[PDB]
């Protein structure tokens, strides 16, 4: 445990700094521990209110996502915290088709290319909040065509339609 260890470091840090500050003084040791304690407490968790919408929680069937027979792959460009890629991939992967993510072993366009070519050999999707607004989302059909123009809605629809079939009642 990383946080657990540090959490214990803080507890003992506060008891030592305070206990020594009073009975053995030493503003040098006192100041050194207090500072180290301040960052320590802020390291493990400055405030719980920080979190929002609550954290993950189990339900019943399965306790995590799945990815193996992914027929499509929806990623985005432009460097970032993978926030946009996780948002779209979540909707696509979770609500529609099950997609994977790749971005290792590749020179230029390592992310978009490595994933689409290696991971998304069948169907691919190059979305992007920035593109969706000023441009739009793209559905790379390396297999059938190469690149398509969709606005997220068509991305999940097209990929799902190509993988599935119309009409459910017979």
CSV table of N, CA and C in Angstrom, one decimal:
chain,number,residue,atom,x,y,z
A,1,UNK,N,0.8,-1.2,0.0
A,1,UNK,CA,0.0,0.0,0.0
A,1,UNK,C,0.9,1.3,0.0
A,2,UNK,N,0.6,2.2,-0.9
A,2,UNK,CA,1.3,3.4,-1.0
A,2,UNK,C,0.7,4.5,-0.1
A,3,UNK,N,-0.6,4.7,-0.3
A,3,UNK,CA,-1.3,5.7,0.6
A,3,UNK,C,-1.3,5.3,2.0
A,4,UNK,N,-1.5,4.0,2.2
A,4,UNK,CA,-1.6,3.5,3.6
A,4,UNK,C,-0.3,3.7,4.3
A,5,UNK,N,0.8,3.5,3.7
A,5,UNK,CA,2.1,3.7,4.3
A,5,UNK,C,2.4,5.1,4.6
A,6,UNK,N,2.1,6.0,3.7
A,6,UNK,CA,2.3,7.5,3.9
A,6,UNK,C,1.3,7.9,5.0
A,7,UNK,N,0.1,7.4,5.0
A,7,UNK,CA,-0.9,7.8,6.0
A,7,UNK,C,-0.3,7.5,7.4
A,8,UNK,N,0.4,6.4,7.5
A,8,UNK,CA,1.0,6.0,8.8
A,8,UNK,C,2.2,6.9,9.0
A,9,UNK,N,2.8,7.4,8.0
A,9,UNK,CA,3.9,8.3,8.1
A,9,UNK,C,3.5,9.7,8.6
A,10,UNK,N,2.3,10.1,8.3
A,10,UNK,CA,1.7,11.3,8.7
A,10,UNK,C,1.4,11.2,10.2
A,11,UNK,N,0.6,10.2,10.6
A,11,UNK,CA,0.2,10.0,12.0
A,11,UNK,C,1.4,10.1,12.9
A,12,UNK,N,2.4,9.3,12.6
A,12,UNK,CA,3.7,9.3,13.4
A,12,UNK,C,4.4,10.6,13.2
A,13,UNK,N,4.2,11.3,12.1
A,13,UNK,CA,4.9,12.5,11.8
A,13,UNK,C,4.3,13.6,12.7
A,14,UNK,N,3.0,13.7,12.8
A,14,UNK,CA,2.4,14.7,13.6
A,14,UNK,C,2.6,14.5,15.1
A,15,UNK,N,2.6,13.2,15.6
A,15,UNK,CA,2.8,12.9,17.0
A,15,UNK,C,4.2,13.2,17.4
A,16,UNK,N,5.2,13.0,16.5
A,16,UNK,CA,6.6,13.2,16.8
A,16,UNK,C,6.9,14.7,16.8
A,17,UNK,N,6.6,15.4,15.7
A,17,UNK,CA,6.8,16.8,15.6
A,17,UNK,C,6.2,17.6,16.7
A,18,UNK,N,4.9,17.3,17.0
A,18,UNK,CA,4.2,18.0,18.1
A,18,UNK,C,4.8,17.6,19.5
A,19,UNK,N,5.0,16.3,19.7
A,19,UNK,CA,5.5,15.8,20.9
A,19,UNK,C,6.9,16.3,21.2
A,20,UNK,N,7.7,16.4,20.2
A,20,UNK,CA,9.1,16.9,20.4
A,20,UNK,C,9.1,18.4,20.4
A,21,UNK,N,8.2,19.0,19.6
A,21,UNK,CA,8.2,20.5,19.6
A,21,UNK,C,8.0,21.0,21.0
A,22,UNK,N,7.1,20.4,21.8
A,22,UNK,CA,6.9,20.8,23.1
A,22,UNK,C,7.9,20.3,24.1
A,23,UNK,N,8.2,19.0,24.1
A,23,UNK,CA,9.2,18.5,25.1
A,23,UNK,C,10.7,18.6,24.7
A,24,UNK,N,11.0,18.6,23.4
A,24,UNK,CA,12.4,18.8,23.0
A,24,UNK,C,12.7,19.9,22.1
A,25,UNK,N,11.7,20.8,22.0
A,25,UNK,CA,11.8,22.0,21.1
A,25,UNK,C,12.5,21.6,19.8
A,26,UNK,N,13.3,22.5,19.2
A,26,UNK,CA,14.0,22.3,18.0
A,26,UNK,C,13.2,22.7,16.8
A,27,UNK,N,13.0,24.0,16.6
A,27,UNK,CA,12.2,24.6,15.5
A,27,UNK,C,12.7,24.0,14.2
A,28,UNK,N,14.0,23.6,14.2
A,28,UNK,CA,14.6,23.0,13.0
A,28,UNK,C,13.9,21.7,12.7
A,29,UNK,N,13.8,20.8,13.7
A,29,UNK,CA,13.2,19.5,13.6
A,29,UNK,C,11.7,19.7,13.5
A,30,UNK,N,11.2,20.6,14.3
A,30,UNK,CA,9.8,20.8,14.3
A,30,UNK,C,9.3,21.4,13.0
A,31,UNK,N,10.0,22.3,12.4
A,31,UNK,CA,9.7,22.9,11.1
A,31,UNK,C,9.8,21.9,10.0
A,32,UNK,N,10.8,21.0,10.1
A,32,UNK,CA,11.1,20.0,9.1
A,32,UNK,C,10.0,19.0,9.1
A,33,UNK,N,9.5,18.6,10.3
A,33,UNK,CA,8.5,17.5,10.4
A,33,UNK,C,7.1,18.1,10.0
A,34,UNK,N,6.8,19.3,10.5
A,34,UNK,CA,5.5,19.9,10.1
A,34,UNK,C,5.4,20.0,8.6
A,35,UNK,N,6.4,20.5,8.0
A,35,UNK,CA,6.4,20.7,6.5
A,35,UNK,C,6.2,19.3,5.8
A,36,UNK,N,7.0,18.4,6.3
A,36,UNK,CA,6.9,17.0,5.7
A,36,UNK,C,5.5,16.4,6.0
A,37,UNK,N,4.9,16.8,7.1
A,37,UNK,CA,3.6,16.3,7.5
A,37,UNK,C,2.5,16.9,6.7
A,38,UNK,N,2.7,18.2,6.4
A,38,UNK,CA,1.7,19.0,5.6
A,38,UNK,C,1.5,18.3,4.3
A,39,UNK,N,2.7,18.1,3.6
A,39,UNK,CA,2.6,17.5,2.3
A,39,UNK,C,2.2,16.0,2.4
A,40,UNK,N,2.6,15.4,3.4
A,40,UNK,CA,2.1,14.0,3.7
A,40,UNK,C,0.6,13.9,3.7
A,41,UNK,N,0.0,14.7,4.6
A,41,UNK,CA,-1.5,14.6,4.7
A,41,UNK,C,-2.1,15.0,3.4
A,42,UNK,N,-1.5,15.9,2.6
A,42,UNK,CA,-2.0,16.3,1.3
A,42,UNK,C,-1.8,15.3,0.3
A,43,UNK,N,-0.8,14.4,0.5
A,43,UNK,CA,-0.5,13.3,-0.4
A,43,UNK,C,-1.5,12.2,-0.4
A,44,UNK,N,-1.7,11.7,0.8
A,44,UNK,CA,-2.7,10.6,0.9
A,44,UNK,C,-4.1,11.1,0.5
A,45,UNK,N,-4.4,12.3,0.9
A,45,UNK,CA,-5.7,12.9,0.6
A,45,UNK,C,-6.0,14.1,1.4
A,46,UNK,N,-5.9,15.3,0.7
A,46,UNK,CA,-6.1,16.6,1.4
A,46,UNK,C,-7.6,16.7,1.9
A,47,UNK,N,-8.5,16.3,1.0
A,47,UNK,CA,-9.9,16.4,1.4
A,47,UNK,C,-10.7,15.4,0.6
A,48,UNK,N,-11.7,14.8,1.3
A,48,UNK,CA,-12.6,13.8,0.6
A,48,UNK,C,-13.6,14.4,-0.3
A,49,UNK,N,-14.0,15.6,0.0
A,49,UNK,CA,-15.0,16.3,-0.8
A,49,UNK,C,-14.5,16.5,-2.2
A,50,UNK,N,-13.2,16.4,-2.4
A,50,UNK,CA,-12.6,16.6,-3.7
A,50,UNK,C,-13.3,15.7,-4.7
A,51,UNK,N,-13.5,14.4,-4.4
A,51,UNK,CA,-14.1,13.5,-5.3
A,51,UNK,C,-15.6,13.9,-5.6
A,52,UNK,N,-16.0,13.5,-6.8
A,52,UNK,CA,-17.4,13.9,-7.2
A,52,UNK,C,-18.1,12.7,-7.9
A,53,UNK,N,-19.4,12.7,-7.8
A,53,UNK,CA,-20.2,11.6,-8.4
A,53,UNK,C,-19.8,10.2,-7.8
A,54,UNK,N,-19.2,10.3,-6.6
A,54,UNK,CA,-18.8,9.0,-6.0
A,54,UNK,C,-17.9,8.2,-6.8
A,55,UNK,N,-17.2,7.3,-6.2
A,55,UNK,CA,-16.2,6.4,-6.9
A,55,UNK,C,-17.0,5.2,-7.5
A,56,UNK,N,-16.2,4.3,-8.1
A,56,UNK,CA,-16.8,3.1,-8.7
A,56,UNK,C,-17.4,2.2,-7.6
A,57,UNK,N,-18.3,1.3,-8.0
A,57,UNK,CA,-19.0,0.5,-7.0
A,57,UNK,C,-19.5,-0.8,-7.7
A,58,UNK,N,-19.4,-2.0,-7.1
A,58,UNK,CA,-19.9,-3.2,-7.7
A,58,UNK,C,-21.5,-3.3,-7.7
A,59,UNK,N,-22.0,-4.1,-8.5
A,59,UNK,CA,-23.5,-4.2,-8.6
A,59,UNK,C,-23.9,-5.7,-8.3
A,60,UNK,N,-23.7,-6.5,-9.3
A,60,UNK,CA,-24.0,-7.9,-9.2
A,60,UNK,C,-23.2,-8.8,-10.2
A,61,UNK,N,-23.6,-8.8,-11.5
A,61,UNK,CA,-22.9,-9.5,-12.5
A,61,UNK,C,-21.6,-8.8,-12.9
A,62,UNK,N,-20.5,-9.5,-12.8
A,62,UNK,CA,-19.2,-9.0,-13.1
A,62,UNK,C,-18.9,-7.7,-12.3
A,63,UNK,N,-17.6,-7.4,-12.2
A,63,UNK,CA,-17.2,-6.2,-11.5
A,63,UNK,C,-16.2,-5.4,-12.3
A,64,UNK,N,-16.2,-5.6,-13.6
A,64,UNK,CA,-15.3,-4.8,-14.4
A,64,UNK,C,-15.7,-5.0,-15.9
A,65,UNK,N,-15.1,-4.2,-16.8
A,65,UNK,CA,-15.4,-4.2,-18.2
A,65,UNK,C,-14.7,-5.4,-18.9
A,66,UNK,N,-14.9,-5.6,-20.2
A,66,UNK,CA,-14.3,-6.7,-20.9
A,66,UNK,C,-13.8,-6.2,-22.3
A,67,UNK,N,-12.8,-6.9,-22.8
A,67,UNK,CA,-12.2,-6.5,-24.1
A,67,UNK,C,-11.3,-7.7,-24.6
A,68,UNK,N,-11.7,-8.2,-25.7
A,68,UNK,CA,-10.9,-9.3,-26.3
A,68,UNK,C,-11.2,-9.5,-27.7
A,69,UNK,N,-12.5,-9.7,-28.0
A,69,UNK,CA,-13.0,-10.0,-29.4
A,69,UNK,C,-13.5,-8.6,-30.0
A,70,UNK,N,-12.9,-7.6,-29.6
A,70,UNK,CA,-13.2,-6.2,-30.1
A,70,UNK,C,-13.1,-6.2,-31.6
A,71,UNK,N,-14.2,-5.8,-32.2
A,71,UNK,CA,-14.3,-5.7,-33.7
A,71,UNK,C,-14.0,-4.2,-34.1
A,72,UNK,N,-14.1,-3.3,-33.2
A,72,UNK,CA,-13.8,-1.9,-33.5
A,72,UNK,C,-12.9,-1.2,-32.5
A,73,UNK,N,-12.5,0.0,-32.8
A,73,UNK,CA,-11.6,0.7,-31.9
A,73,UNK,C,-11.8,2.2,-32.1
A,74,UNK,N,-12.3,2.9,-31.1
A,74,UNK,CA,-12.5,4.4,-31.2
A,74,UNK,C,-11.5,5.2,-30.3
A,75,UNK,N,-10.6,5.9,-30.9
A,75,UNK,CA,-9.7,6.7,-30.2
A,75,UNK,C,-9.7,8.2,-30.7
A,76,UNK,N,-8.8,9.0,-30.1
A,76,UNK,CA,-8.8,10.4,-30.5
A,76,UNK,C,-7.3,10.8,-30.6
A,77,UNK,N,-7.1,12.0,-31.3
A,77,UNK,CA,-5.8,12.6,-31.5
A,77,UNK,C,-5.5,13.7,-30.5
A,78,UNK,N,-4.4,14.4,-30.7
A,78,UNK,CA,-4.0,15.5,-29.8
A,78,UNK,C,-3.7,15.0,-28.4
A,79,UNK,N,-2.5,15.4,-27.9
A,79,UNK,CA,-2.0,14.9,-26.6
A,79,UNK,C,-3.0,15.4,-25.5
A,80,UNK,N,-3.2,14.6,-24.5
A,80,UNK,CA,-4.1,15.0,-23.4
A,80,UNK,C,-4.0,13.9,-22.3
A,81,UNK,N,-5.0,13.9,-21.4
A,81,UNK,CA,-5.1,13.0,-20.3
A,81,UNK,C,-6.0,11.8,-20.6
A,82,UNK,N,-6.1,11.5,-21.9
A,82,UNK,CA,-7.0,10.4,-22.3
A,82,UNK,C,-8.4,10.5,-21.8
A,83,UNK,N,-8.8,11.8,-21.4
A,83,UNK,CA,-10.1,12.0,-20.9
A,83,UNK,C,-11.2,11.9,-22.0
A,84,UNK,N,-10.9,12.5,-23.1
A,84,UNK,CA,-11.8,12.4,-24.3
A,84,UNK,C,-11.9,11.0,-24.9
A,85,UNK,N,-10.7,10.4,-24.9
A,85,UNK,CA,-10.6,9.0,-25.5
A,85,UNK,C,-11.4,8.0,-24.6
A,86,UNK,N,-11.3,8.3,-23.3
A,86,UNK,CA,-12.0,7.4,-22.3
A,86,UNK,C,-13.5,7.7,-22.3
A,87,UNK,N,-13.9,8.9,-22.6
A,87,UNK,CA,-15.4,9.2,-22.6
A,87,UNK,C,-16.0,8.6,-23.8
A,88,UNK,N,-15.5,8.8,-25.0
A,88,UNK,CA,-16.1,8.2,-26.2
A,88,UNK,C,-16.0,6.7,-26.2
A,89,UNK,N,-14.8,6.2,-25.9
A,89,UNK,CA,-14.5,4.8,-25.9
A,89,UNK,C,-15.5,4.1,-24.9
A,90,UNK,N,-15.8,4.8,-23.8
A,90,UNK,CA,-16.7,4.3,-22.8
A,90,UNK,C,-18.1,4.1,-23.4
A,91,UNK,N,-18.6,5.1,-24.0
A,91,UNK,CA,-20.0,5.0,-24.6
A,91,UNK,C,-20.0,3.9,-25.7
A,92,UNK,N,-19.0,4.0,-26.6
A,92,UNK,CA,-18.9,3.0,-27.7
A,92,UNK,C,-18.7,1.6,-27.1
A,93,UNK,N,-17.5,1.5,-26.5
A,93,UNK,CA,-17.2,0.2,-25.9
A,93,UNK,C,-18.3,-0.4,-25.0
A,94,UNK,N,-18.7,0.4,-24.1
A,94,UNK,CA,-19.7,0.0,-23.1
A,94,UNK,C,-21.2,-0.1,-23.7
A,95,UNK,N,-21.7,0.9,-24.4
A,95,UNK,CA,-23.1,0.9,-24.8
A,95,UNK,C,-23.3,0.1,-26.2
A,96,UNK,N,-22.3,0.2,-27.0
A,96,UNK,CA,-22.4,-0.5,-28.3
A,96,UNK,C,-21.5,-1.7,-28.4
A,97,UNK,N,-20.5,-1.5,-29.2
A,97,UNK,CA,-19.5,-2.5,-29.5
A,97,UNK,C,-18.4,-2.4,-28.5
A,98,UNK,N,-17.7,-3.5,-28.3
A,98,UNK,CA,-16.6,-3.6,-27.4
A,98,UNK,C,-15.2,-3.3,-28.1
A,99,UNK,N,-14.7,-2.1,-27.8
A,99,UNK,CA,-13.4,-1.7,-28.4
A,99,UNK,C,-12.2,-1.8,-27.4
A,100,UNK,N,-11.0,-1.8,-28.0
A,100,UNK,CA,-9.8,-1.9,-27.3
A,100,UNK,C,-9.0,-0.6,-27.5
A,101,UNK,N,-7.8,-0.5,-26.8
A,101,UNK,CA,-7.0,0.7,-27.0
A,101,UNK,C,-5.5,0.4,-27.1
A,102,UNK,N,-4.8,0.9,-28.1
A,102,UNK,CA,-3.4,0.7,-28.3
A,102,UNK,C,-2.7,2.0,-28.6
A,103,UNK,N,-1.4,2.0,-28.4
A,103,UNK,CA,-0.6,3.2,-28.6
A,103,UNK,C,0.9,2.9,-28.3
A,104,UNK,N,1.4,1.7,-28.4
A,104,UNK,CA,2.8,1.3,-28.1
A,104,UNK,C,3.5,0.8,-29.3
A,105,UNK,N,4.7,1.1,-29.5
A,105,UNK,CA,5.5,0.6,-30.6
A,105,UNK,C,5.1,1.2,-31.9
A,106,UNK,N,5.5,2.4,-32.2
A,106,UNK,CA,5.2,3.1,-33.4
A,106,UNK,C,5.8,4.5,-33.4
A,107,UNK,N,6.3,5.0,-34.6
A,107,UNK,CA,7.0,6.3,-34.7
A,107,UNK,C,5.9,7.4,-34.7
A,108,UNK,N,5.5,7.8,-35.9
A,108,UNK,CA,4.5,8.9,-36.1
A,108,UNK,C,3.1,8.4,-36.0
A,109,UNK,N,2.2,9.2,-35.5
A,109,UNK,CA,0.8,8.8,-35.3
A,109,UNK,C,0.7,7.5,-34.6
A,110,UNK,N,1.7,7.3,-33.7
A,110,UNK,CA,1.8,6.0,-32.9
A,110,UNK,C,0.5,5.7,-32.3
A,111,UNK,N,-0.2,6.7,-31.7
A,111,UNK,CA,-1.5,6.4,-31.0
A,111,UNK,C,-2.6,6.0,-32.0
A,112,UNK,N,-3.0,6.9,-32.9
A,112,UNK,CA,-4.0,6.7,-33.8
A,112,UNK,C,-3.7,5.6,-34.8
A,113,UNK,N,-2.5,5.5,-35.3
A,113,UNK,CA,-2.1,4.5,-36.2
A,113,UNK,C,-1.9,3.1,-35.6
A,114,UNK,N,-1.1,3.0,-34.6
A,114,UNK,CA,-0.8,1.7,-33.9
A,114,UNK,C,-2.1,1.1,-33.4
A,115,UNK,N,-3.1,1.9,-32.9
A,115,UNK,CA,-4.3,1.3,-32.4
A,115,UNK,C,-5.2,0.9,-33.5
A,116,UNK,N,-5.4,1.8,-34.5
A,116,UNK,CA,-6.3,1.5,-35.6
A,116,UNK,C,-5.8,0.4,-36.5
A,117,UNK,N,-4.5,0.3,-36.8
A,117,UNK,CA,-3.9,-0.7,-37.6
A,117,UNK,C,-3.9,-2.0,-36.9
A,118,UNK,N,-3.2,-2.1,-35.7
A,118,UNK,CA,-3.0,-3.3,-34.9
A,118,UNK,C,-4.2,-3.7,-34.1
A,119,UNK,N,-4.8,-2.8,-33.3
A,119,UNK,CA,-5.9,-3.1,-32.5
A,119,UNK,C,-7.3,-3.0,-33.2
A,120,UNK,N,-7.4,-2.0,-34.1
A,120,UNK,CA,-8.7,-1.9,-34.8
A,120,UNK,C,-8.5,-2.2,-36.3
A,121,UNK,N,-8.1,-3.4,-36.6
A,121,UNK,CA,-7.9,-3.8,-38.0
A,121,UNK,C,-9.2,-3.8,-38.7
A,122,UNK,N,-10.3,-4.2,-38.0
A,122,UNK,CA,-11.7,-4.2,-38.7
A,122,UNK,C,-12.3,-2.9,-38.8
A,123,UNK,N,-12.7,-2.3,-37.6
A,123,UNK,CA,-13.3,-1.0,-37.6
A,123,UNK,C,-12.6,0.0,-36.7
A,124,UNK,N,-12.5,1.2,-37.0
A,124,UNK,CA,-11.8,2.2,-36.2
A,124,UNK,C,-12.6,3.5,-36.2
A,125,UNK,N,-12.4,4.4,-35.2
A,125,UNK,CA,-13.1,5.6,-35.0
A,125,UNK,C,-12.2,6.7,-34.4
A,126,UNK,N,-12.0,7.8,-35.1
A,126,UNK,CA,-11.1,8.9,-34.7
A,126,UNK,C,-12.0,10.1,-34.3
A,127,UNK,N,-12.6,10.0,-33.1
A,127,UNK,CA,-13.4,11.1,-32.6
A,127,UNK,C,-12.6,12.3,-32.0
A,128,UNK,N,-13.2,13.0,-31.1
A,128,UNK,CA,-12.5,14.2,-30.5
A,128,UNK,C,-13.4,15.3,-30.3
A,129,UNK,N,-13.6,15.6,-29.0
A,129,UNK,CA,-14.5,16.7,-28.6
A,129,UNK,C,-14.1,18.0,-29.4
A,130,UNK,N,-12.8,18.2,-29.6
A,130,UNK,CA,-12.4,19.4,-30.4
A,130,UNK,C,-12.8,19.2,-31.8
A,131,UNK,N,-12.8,18.0,-32.3
A,131,UNK,CA,-13.2,17.8,-33.7
A,131,UNK,C,-14.7,17.8,-33.8
A,132,UNK,N,-15.3,17.1,-32.9
A,132,UNK,CA,-16.8,17.1,-32.9
A,132,UNK,C,-17.4,18.5,-33.0
A,133,UNK,N,-16.8,19.4,-32.3
A,133,UNK,CA,-17.3,20.8,-32.3
A,133,UNK,C,-16.9,21.6,-33.6
A,134,UNK,N,-15.6,21.7,-33.8
A,134,UNK,CA,-15.1,22.5,-35.0
A,134,UNK,C,-15.2,21.7,-36.2
A,135,UNK,N,-15.0,20.4,-36.1
A,135,UNK,CA,-15.0,19.5,-37.2
A,135,UNK,C,-16.1,18.4,-37.2
A,136,UNK,N,-15.7,17.3,-36.5
A,136,UNK,CA,-16.6,16.2,-36.3
A,136,UNK,C,-15.8,14.9,-36.0
A,137,UNK,N,-16.6,13.8,-35.8
A,137,UNK,CA,-15.9,12.5,-35.5
A,137,UNK,C,-15.7,11.7,-36.7
A,138,UNK,N,-14.8,10.8,-36.7
A,138,UNK,CA,-14.4,10.0,-37.9
A,138,UNK,C,-14.5,8.5,-37.6
A,139,UNK,N,-14.9,7.7,-38.5
A,139,UNK,CA,-15.0,6.3,-38.4
A,139,UNK,C,-14.1,5.6,-39.4
A,140,UNK,N,-12.9,5.3,-39.0
A,140,UNK,CA,-11.9,4.7,-39.9
A,140,UNK,C,-12.3,3.3,-40.2
A,141,UNK,N,-12.5,3.0,-41.5
A,141,UNK,CA,-12.9,1.7,-42.0
A,141,UNK,C,-11.8,1.1,-42.8
A,142,UNK,N,-10.6,1.0,-42.1
A,142,UNK,CA,-9.4,0.4,-42.8
A,142,UNK,C,-9.7,-0.8,-43.6
A,143,UNK,N,-10.7,-1.6,-43.1
A,143,UNK,CA,-11.1,-2.8,-43.8
A,143,UNK,C,-11.9,-2.5,-45.0
A,144,UNK,N,-13.1,-1.9,-44.9
A,144,UNK,CA,-14.0,-1.6,-46.0
A,144,UNK,C,-13.5,-0.4,-46.8
A,145,UNK,N,-13.4,0.8,-46.2
A,145,UNK,CA,-13.0,2.0,-46.9
A,145,UNK,C,-11.7,2.5,-46.4
A,146,UNK,N,-11.8,3.4,-45.4
A,146,UNK,CA,-10.6,4.0,-44.8
A,146,UNK,C,-11.0,5.0,-43.7
A,147,UNK,N,-11.7,6.0,-44.1
A,147,UNK,CA,-12.2,7.0,-43.1
A,147,UNK,C,-13.6,7.5,-43.4
A,148,UNK,N,-14.4,7.6,-42.4
A,148,UNK,CA,-15.8,8.1,-42.6
A,148,UNK,C,-16.1,9.3,-41.7
A,149,UNK,N,-17.1,10.0,-42.1
A,149,UNK,CA,-17.5,11.2,-41.3
A,149,UNK,C,-18.8,11.0,-40.5
A,150,UNK,N,-18.6,11.0,-39.2
A,150,UNK,CA,-19.8,10.8,-38.3
A,150,UNK,C,-19.8,11.7,-37.1
A,151,UNK,N,-20.9,11.9,-36.5
A,151,UNK,CA,-21.0,12.8,-35.4
A,151,UNK,C,-21.3,12.0,-34.1
A,152,UNK,N,-20.4,11.1,-33.8
A,152,UNK,CA,-20.6,10.2,-32.6
A,152,UNK,C,-21.8,9.3,-32.7
A,153,UNK,N,-23.0,9.8,-33.0
A,153,UNK,CA,-24.2,9.0,-33.1
A,153,UNK,C,-24.0,8.0,-34.2
A,154,UNK,N,-23.5,8.5,-35.4
A,154,UNK,CA,-23.3,7.6,-36.5
A,154,UNK,C,-22.2,6.7,-36.3
A,155,UNK,N,-21.3,7.0,-35.4
A,155,UNK,CA,-20.1,6.2,-35.1
A,155,UNK,C,-20.6,4.9,-34.4
A,156,UNK,N,-21.4,5.0,-33.4
A,156,UNK,CA,-21.9,3.8,-32.7
A,156,UNK,C,-22.9,3.1,-33.6
A,157,UNK,N,-23.7,3.8,-34.3
A,157,UNK,CA,-24.7,3.2,-35.2
A,157,UNK,C,-24.1,2.4,-36.3
A,158,UNK,N,-23.2,3.1,-37.1
A,158,UNK,CA,-22.5,2.4,-38.2
A,158,UNK,C,-21.8,1.2,-37.8
A,159,UNK,N,-20.9,1.3,-36.8
A,159,UNK,CA,-20.1,0.2,-36.3
A,159,UNK,C,-21.0,-0.9,-35.9
A,160,UNK,N,-22.0,-0.6,-35.1
A,160,UNK,CA,-22.9,-1.6,-34.6
A,160,UNK,C,-23.7,-2.3,-35.7
A,161,UNK,N,-24.2,-1.4,-36.7
A,161,UNK,CA,-25.0,-1.9,-37.8
A,161,UNK,C,-24.1,-2.9,-38.7
A,162,UNK,N,-22.9,-2.5,-38.9
A,162,UNK,CA,-22.0,-3.3,-39.7
A,162,UNK,C,-21.7,-4.6,-39.0
A,163,UNK,N,-21.6,-4.6,-37.7
A,163,UNK,CA,-21.3,-5.8,-36.9
A,163,UNK,C,-22.6,-6.6,-36.7
A,164,UNK,N,-23.7,-5.9,-36.6
A,164,UNK,CA,-25.0,-6.6,-36.3
A,164,UNK,C,-25.9,-6.6,-37.6
A,165,UNK,N,-27.2,-6.8,-37.4
A,165,UNK,CA,-28.1,-6.9,-38.5
A,165,UNK,C,-29.4,-6.2,-38.1
A,166,UNK,N,-30.1,-5.6,-39.1
A,166,UNK,CA,-31.4,-5.0,-38.9
A,166,UNK,C,-32.5,-5.9,-38.7
A,167,UNK,N,-33.6,-5.5,-38.1
A,167,UNK,CA,-34.8,-6.3,-37.8
A,167,UNK,C,-34.5,-7.4,-36.8
A,168,UNK,N,-35.3,-7.4,-35.7
A,168,UNK,CA,-35.1,-8.4,-34.7
A,168,UNK,C,-36.2,-9.4,-34.6
A,169,UNK,N,-37.4,-9.0,-35.1
A,169,UNK,CA,-38.6,-9.8,-35.0
A,169,UNK,C,-38.7,-10.6,-36.4
A,170,UNK,N,-39.1,-11.8,-36.3
A,170,UNK,CA,-39.3,-12.7,-37.5
A,170,UNK,C,-40.7,-13.4,-37.4
